[PDB]
Amino acid sequence: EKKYIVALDQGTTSSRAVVMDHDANIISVSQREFEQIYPKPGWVEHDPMEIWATQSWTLVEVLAKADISSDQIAAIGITNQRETTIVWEKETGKPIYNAIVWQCRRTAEICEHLKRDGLEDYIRSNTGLVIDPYFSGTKVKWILDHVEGSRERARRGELLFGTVDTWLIWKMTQGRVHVTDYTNASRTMLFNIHTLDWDDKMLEVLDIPREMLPEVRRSSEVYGQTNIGTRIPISGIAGDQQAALFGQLCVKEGMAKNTYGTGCFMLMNTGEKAVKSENGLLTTIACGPTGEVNYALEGAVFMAGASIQWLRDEMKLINDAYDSEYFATKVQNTNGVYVVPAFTGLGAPYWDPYARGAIFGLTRGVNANHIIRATLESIAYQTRDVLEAMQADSGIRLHALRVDGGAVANNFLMQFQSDILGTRVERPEVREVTALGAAYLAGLAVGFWQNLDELQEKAVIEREFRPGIETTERNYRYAGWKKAVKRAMAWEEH
Amino acid sequence: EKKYIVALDQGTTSSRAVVMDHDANIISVSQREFEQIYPKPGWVEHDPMEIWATQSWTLVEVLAKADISSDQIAAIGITNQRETTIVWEKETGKPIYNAIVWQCRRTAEICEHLKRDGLEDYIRSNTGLVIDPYFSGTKVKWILDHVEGSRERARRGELLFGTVDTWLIWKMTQGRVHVTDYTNASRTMLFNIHTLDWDDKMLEVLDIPREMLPEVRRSSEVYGQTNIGTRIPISGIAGDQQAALFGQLCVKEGMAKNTYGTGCFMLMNTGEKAVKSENGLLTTIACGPTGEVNYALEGAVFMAGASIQWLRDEMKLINDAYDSEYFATKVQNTNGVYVVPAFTGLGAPYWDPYARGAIFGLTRGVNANHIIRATLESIAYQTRDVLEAMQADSGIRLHALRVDGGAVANNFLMQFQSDILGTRVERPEVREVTALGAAYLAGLAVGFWQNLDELQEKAVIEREFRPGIETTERNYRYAGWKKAVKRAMAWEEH
Ligand SMILES: Nc1ncnc2c1ncn2[C@@H]1O[C@H](COP(=O)(O)OP(=O)(O)CP(=O)(O)O)[C@@H](O)[C@H]1O
Ligand SMILES: Nc1ncnc2c1ncn2[C@@H]1O[C@H](COP(=O)(O)OP(=O)(O)CP(=O)(O)O)[C@@H](O)[C@H]1O
Ligand SMILES: [Mg+2]
Ligand SMILES: [Mg+2]
Give counts: helices (H), strands (E), chain A: 15, 23
Q: Is B361's CB within 8 Å of A491's CB? A: yes
- With beta carbons less than 8 A apart as the criterion, state whether A103 and A344 touch: yes
Q: A358 and B357: CB-CB below 8 Å? A: no
Give me the resolution in angstroms, 1 decimal: 3.0
CATH number (domain holding residue B200): 3.30.420.40
**Chain B residues close to A365, C-beta within 8 Å:** 38, 41, 314
Alpha carbon of A110 to those of A132, A135, A205, A492: distances in Å?
A: 9, 12, 11, 17
Query: What is the B454 CA–ligand 2 centroid distance (Å)?
Result: 29
Q: Which residues of B touch A41 (CB under 8 A)?
A: 363-365
Residue ending a domain, choose from A195, A219, A248: A248
Quick one: how far is CA B471 from the chain centroid? 32
Measured distance CA(A177)–CA(A76) in Å, rounded: 15
Q: Calculate the alpha carbon distances from A258 to A241, A387, A430, A472 in Å.
A: 10, 9, 15, 25
Looking at residue B56, the DSSP 8-state letter turns out to be H
Domain that holds residue B486: 249-494
Distances from the Cα of B38 to the Cαs of A371, A418, B46, B489, in angstroms? Answer: 17, 31, 9, 21
Question: Is there a single domain that holds both residue B339 and residue B474?
Answer: yes
Q: Is B364 within 8 Å of B293 (Cβ atoms)?
A: no
Distance A406 CA to ligand 1 centre (A): 4
Q: How far apart are CA B409 and CA B260, in angstroms?
A: 10
Spatial distance between the Cα atoms of A424 and A294, rounded to a whole number of angstroms: 26
Based on the fold, state whether residues A162 and A268 are members of the same structural domain.
no
Neighbours of A148 (CB within 10 A): 8
How many domains does chain A fold into? 2
What distance in Å separates the CA atoms of residue B455 and residue B444, rounded to the nearest whole number? 11
**Residues of chain A found within 8 Å of residue B378, distances taken between Cβ atoms:** none
Which residues of chain B lie closer than 8 angstroms to A367, CB-CB?
A: 314-316
Residues A44 and A35: beta-carbon distance below 8 Å: no
A397 and A283 part of one domain: yes
Please list, residue by residue across B49-68, b when 16 or more beta carbons sit within 10 angstroms of its beta carbon and e when fewer do: ebbbebbbbbbeebbeeeeb
**Statement to judge: residues A205 and A263 lie in one domain:** no
- Please identify among residues 320-339 of chain A the ones whose CB lies closer than 8 Å to any CB of chain B: 335-336
Around ion ligand 4, residues with a beta carbon closer than 5 Å are B 11, 240
Residues B253 and B243 in one domain: no
Specify whether B6 is located in the same domain as B70: yes
Query: Which parts of A60-208 are beta strand (E)?
Result: 73-80, 85-89, 94-95, 99-100, 159-163, 179-181
DSSP helix/strand/coil, A267: strand
Q: Which of A405, A419, A279, A269 is nearest to A351 (CA)?
A: A279
CB contact under 8 A, A364 and B36: yes
**Residue with the nearest Cα to atom 20 of ligand 2?**
B261
Among residues A461, A402, A437, A7, which one has the least CA distance to residue A247?
Answer: A437
Nearest residue in A to B354, CA atom: A361
Select from A5, A75, A62 the least CA-distant residue to A28.
A62
Q: Identify from A101, A309, A330, A362 which residue to disrupt to test chain B contact, counting B C-beta atoms within 10 A and taking the largest count.
A: A362
Query: Among residues B230, B248, B266, which one ends one of the domains?
Result: B248
Q: Whose CA is nearest to atom 6 of ligand 1?
A: A407
Say whether both B234 and B331 belong to one domain: no
Q: What CA–CA distance (Å, rounded) separates A249 from A439?
A: 12
Task: Say whether both B168 and B289 belong to one domain.
Answer: no
Chain A residues inside the 8 Å CB shell of B36:
364
| Cβ partners under 8 Å of residue B421, min gap 6 | B380, B383, B384, B387, B401, B467
- Which approach determined this entry? X-ray
* Protein residues whose CB sits closer than 6 Å to any atom of ligand 2: B 11-14, 81, 261-262, 305-306, 308-309, 321-322, 324-325, 405-407, 409-410
Tell which residue, B385, B409, B474, B439, has the closest CA to residue B238.
Answer: B439
Which of B229, B248, B267 is the last residue in one of the domains? Answer: B248
DSSP lists the bridge partners of residue B180 as: B216
Strands (E), A98-137: 99-100
DSSP secondary structure of A50-76: HHHHHHHHHHHHHHHHHT--GGGEEEE
Give the ligand whose atoms come closest to the C-alpha of residue A431: 1
Backbone angles phi, psi at B388, to 5 degrees: -50, -50
**Nearest alpha carbon, ligand 2 atom 26:** B12
Which of A35, A248, A262 has the most ligand 1 atoms within 8 A of CB, as the residue to mutate?
A262
In angstroms, rounded to a whole number, what is the distance separating the alpha carbons of residues B48 and B34?
Answer: 10
Residues A152 and A257 in one domain: no
> At B137, which amino acid appears?
G
Tell me whether residue B456 is exposed, middle or buried, using C-beta atoms within 10 angstroms of its C-beta: 0 to 12, 13 to 18, 19 or more.
Answer: exposed
Task: Spell out the alpha helix ranges (H) of A173-239.
Answer: 182-187, 200-202
Q: Which of residues 21-60 of A touch B (CB under 8 A)?
A: 38, 41
Q: Could you tell me if B235 and B220 are in contact, meaning their C-beta atoms sit under 8 angstroms apart?
A: yes
Contact present, A359 and B358 (Cβ < 8 Å): yes
Task: Answer yes or no: is the C-beta of A326 below 6 A from any ligand 1 atom.
Answer: no
Q: Which of A333, A354, A364, A370 to mutate to test the interface with B (most CBs of B within 10 A)?
A: A364
Distance (Å, whole) CA A480 – CA B145? 31
Quick check: B165 and B242 in contact, CB under 8 A? no
Residue B240 · residue B82 · CB < 8 Å: yes
Same domain, A264 and A240: no
Which residue's CA lies nearest to atom 25 of ligand 2?
Answer: B11
Residue B75 CA to chain centroid, in angstroms? 23
Q: Which atom of ligand 1 is nearest to the CA of A322?
A: 1
Q: Which residues of A touch B491 (CB under 8 A)?
A: 360-361, 483
User: DSSP label at B439?
Assistant: H
Amino acid at A42: G
Supply the residue whose CA is at minimum distance from atom 27 of ligand 2.
Answer: B13
Residues 360-379 of A with CB under 8 A from B: 360-368, 371
Buried b (16+ CB within 10 A) or exposed e, B184-205: bbbbbbbbbbeeeebbeebbeb
Spell out the alpha helix ranges (H) of A345-401.
368-394
Cross-chain residue pair B344–A362, CB shorter than 8 Å: no
Cα–Cα distance measured from residue A250 to residue B129, given in angstroms and rounded to the nearest whole number: 65
B interface test, pick of A363, A371, A475, A485 with most B CB neighbours within 10 Å: A363
Q: Tell me which of B78, B308, B413 to substitute to probe ligand 2's pocket, judged by most ligand atoms within 8 Å of the beta carbon.
A: B308
Among candidates A462, A489, A447, which has minimal Cα distance to A403? A462
- CA–CA gap between residue B62 and residue B51 (Å, rounded): 17
In this complex, do A356 and B343 lie within 8 Å of one another by their Cβ atoms?
no
Question: Same structural domain for residues A235 and A282?
Answer: no
d(CA B425, CA B401): 5
Q: Could you tell me if A109 and A80 are in contact, meaning their C-beta atoms sit under 8 angstroms apart?
A: no
Q: Give the dihedral sign, CA B42/B47/B51/B54.
A: negative
CB contact under 8 A, A367 and B36: no
Contacts of B344 in chain A (CB under 8 A): 363-364
Chain B closest CA to A485's CA: distance in Å? 11
Helix (H, G, I), strand (E, B) or coil at B493: coil
Query: SS3 of B238, please?
Result: strand
Residue closest by Cα to atom 23 of ligand 2? B262
CB-based contact A343 B364, cutoff 8 Å: yes
Instruction: Please state whether beta strands B238-239 and B73-80 pair in parallel, antiparallel, or not at all (unpaired).
Output: parallel
Residues in chain B: 494
Residues B283 and B230 in one domain: no
- Distance (Å) from CA A12 to ligand 3 centroid: 6
Gyration radius from chain B CA atoms: 22
Could you give the maximum distance between any two Cα atoms of chain A, in Å?
68
Closest by CA position to B82, among listed B98, B63, B104: B104
Q: Chain A contact for B399, CB < 8 A? A: no
